[PDB]
Amino acid sequence: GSLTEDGLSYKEKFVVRSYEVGSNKTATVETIANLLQEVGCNHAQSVGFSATTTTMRKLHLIWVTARMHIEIYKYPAWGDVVEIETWCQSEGRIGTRRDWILKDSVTGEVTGRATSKWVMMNQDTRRLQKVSDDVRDEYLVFCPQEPRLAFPEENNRSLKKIPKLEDPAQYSMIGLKPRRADLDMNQHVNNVTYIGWVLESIPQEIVDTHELQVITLDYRRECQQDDVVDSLTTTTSNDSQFLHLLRLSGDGQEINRGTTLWRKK
Amino acid sequence: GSLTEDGLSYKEKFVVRSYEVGSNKTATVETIANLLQEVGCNHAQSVGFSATTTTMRKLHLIWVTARMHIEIYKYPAWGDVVEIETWCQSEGRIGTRRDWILKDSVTGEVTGRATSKWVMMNQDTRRLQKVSDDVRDEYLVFCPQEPRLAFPEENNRSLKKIPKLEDPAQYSMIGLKPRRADLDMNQHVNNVTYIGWVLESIPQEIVDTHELQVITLDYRRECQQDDVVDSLTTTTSDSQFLHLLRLSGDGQEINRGTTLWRKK
Numbered sequence: 248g249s250l251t252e253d254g255l256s257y258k259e260k261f262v263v264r265s266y267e268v269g270s271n272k273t274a275t276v277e278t279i280a281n282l283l284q285e286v287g288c289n290h291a292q293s294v295g296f297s298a299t300t301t302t303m304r305k306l307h308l309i310w311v312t313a314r315m316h317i318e319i320y321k322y323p324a325w326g327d328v329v330e331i332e333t334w335c336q337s338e339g340r341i342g343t344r345r346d347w348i349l350k351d352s353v354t355g356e357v358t359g360r361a362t363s364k365w366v367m368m369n370q371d372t373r374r375l376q377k378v379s380d381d382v383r384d385e386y387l388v389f390c391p392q393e394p395r396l397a398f399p400e401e402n403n404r405s406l407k408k409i410p411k412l413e414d415p416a417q418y419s420m421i422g423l424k425p426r427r428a429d430l431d432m433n434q435h436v437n438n439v440t441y442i443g444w445v446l447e448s449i450p451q452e453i454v455d456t457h458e459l460q461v462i463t464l465d466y467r468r469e470c471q472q473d474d475v476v477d478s479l480t481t482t483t484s485n486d487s488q489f490l491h492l493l494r495l496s497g498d499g500q501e502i503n504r505g506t507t508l509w510r511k512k
Numbered sequence: 513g514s515l516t517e518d519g520l521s522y523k524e525k526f527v528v529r530s531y532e533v534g535s536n537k538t539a540t541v542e543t544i545a546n547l548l549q550e551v552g553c554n555h556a557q558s559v560g561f562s563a564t565t566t567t568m569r570k571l572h573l574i575w576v577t578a579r580m581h582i583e584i585y586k587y588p589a590w591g592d593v594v595e596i597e598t599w600c601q602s603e604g605r606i607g608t609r610r611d612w613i614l615k616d617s618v619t620g621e622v623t624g625r626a627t628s629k630w631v632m633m634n635q636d637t638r639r640l641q642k643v644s645d646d647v648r649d650e651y652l653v654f655c656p657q658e659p660r661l662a663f664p665e666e667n668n669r670s671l672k673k674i675p676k677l678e679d680p681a682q683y684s685m686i687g688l689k690p691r692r693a694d695l696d697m698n699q700h701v702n703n704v705t706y707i708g709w710v711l712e713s714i715p716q717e718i719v720d721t722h723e724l725q726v727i728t729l730d731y732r733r734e735c736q737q738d739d740v741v742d743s744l745t746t747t748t749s750d751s752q753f754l755h756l757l758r759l760s761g762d763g764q765e766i767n768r769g770t771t772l773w774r775k776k
């Protein structure tokens with residue numbers, strides 16, 4: 248991987264592995280989500296981040312994902328090379344946005360795109376705080392000044408409000424627990440695990456007959472290493488749509504909400 | 513990746529990813545096990561296997577792992593390149609062996625080694641069969657003739673008999689279920705998932721203060737997509753543990769193993 252000529256974005260090629268593909272011999276949405284995370288970390292590394300700034304480490308501040316939105320047109324096949332370009336942009340004091348474009352390395356065609364909203368939080372108290380001016384300037388030199396959006400469309404699906412699923416859910420997968428492979432280097436549950444847990448309540452018949460086109464996920468609260476999760480799905484719709492909810496198995500405390508859009512094979 | 517000059521082994525370089533490392537910023541044993549699987553599949557692909565031969569497909573025969581043994585000296589750090597060399601050898605009618613050598617791409621030093629025993633099974637009836645002779649010859653041309661062992665030392669850990677853990681276990685992790693990410697392209701539970709499930713019953717105190725040096729795992733039965741698993745561990749000792757994976761209901765055995773850990 249390498250920063251582009253202008254130094255304002257990062258590109259990386261990946262060869263799709265055998266264990267990274269599903270029944271269609273193409274990469275799963277969790278494999279894609281892992282590759283976006285990987286290219287995102289390599290971009291921060293390439294511009295001097297061990298992605299916390301000098302001031303953030305001092306104040307015990309971290310960047311946390313609030314929303315993730317992925318749209319896939321063609322999932323890469325096992326053995327294919329996928330090129331991913333990523334960049335960040337500040338969206339005022341609300342936080343930052345990280346965008347990705349996935350391309351077929353051979354043809355150059357856009358096979359997918361993604362966007363994410365990040366907010367500043369104290370690692371210890373978990374309290375959100377707006378981006379201070381001194382923090383903002385530290386990372387403005389690594390972002391393009393003019394707007395550059397993976398989702399520029401007038402009324403695009405990446406900014407739609409997500410409602411709360413009402414009980415009874417149509418489908419459910421109960422008692423989901425993270426294992427050590429689900430934890431990152433800081434022993435927190437990886438953001439990608441929640442995508443897999445959302446998809447666990449989709450019936451196998453939808454998975455076998457449809458392709459996942461769009462997934463939007465809101466992150467409300469993190470699942471601890473010793474927490475148990477319940478995954479809920481209700482159909483909201485030639486295309487299938489679902490409303491999703493992740494909540495703590497005990498008191499029913501919300502951890503995530505989302506929607507998926509599937510198209511017939 | 514590419515076959516070596518003699519065409520009798522395969523090499524591949526891998527850069528360790530951010531999500532592939534644990535709390536020590538080094539690759540987990542499941543990441544290593546995934547890379548061995550990846551280099552093993554790329555080797556079969558490079559020699560014409562689209563690793564069943566054309567005769568095996570006609571008979572509905574597959575290769576199944578019976579035993580896995582991994583020894584790690586140094587886990588690669590996040591961002592490092594690891595070079596893995598793999599090869600196969602026939603071990604008579606019992607089955608085939610696949611071996612691996614892991615090296616630091618920068619220094620050339622051996623950082624780990626692995627071995628696995630594979631047996632021929634009918635995919636439908638699940639009945640174990642000898643490799644026959646017409647099937648033998650089809651893949652003998654891709655293996656070295658003289659012995660080439662990742663574990664040559666007479667009386668080594670990779671061939672030691674594994675006993676069955678007696679109840680009550682010292683530690684346990686119950687109700688383990690596979691999710692879709694745990695399944696391979698054929699909707700079977702990936703053989704790497706069982707390693708993660710074995711390690712789930714090791715106390716976090718051992719993981720935080722020790723490094724996993726050796727792991728030997730016997731595969732007795734596959735866990736179905738809708739099965740629930742119980743993971744059991746008892747200390748037998750450096751720390752040593754005896755492991756057992758069994759079906760959450762009737763207690764039907766799926767795996768047995770041992771681990772060896774060294775103080776950091």
Ligand SMILES: CC(C)CNC(=O)c1nccn1C
Nearest residue numbers: 280283284287288312315438
């Ligand atoms: C939004 C989910 C899929 C996580 N993806 C990321 O972008 C990420 N997580 C940690 C560091 N990065 C770059």
Ligand SMILES: CC(C)CNC(=O)c1nccn1C
Nearest residue numbers: 545548549552553577703704
């Ligand atoms: C590495 C351990 C978990 C065993 N897995 C493999 O080697 C394998 N599975 C399918 C194809 N290969 C080469």
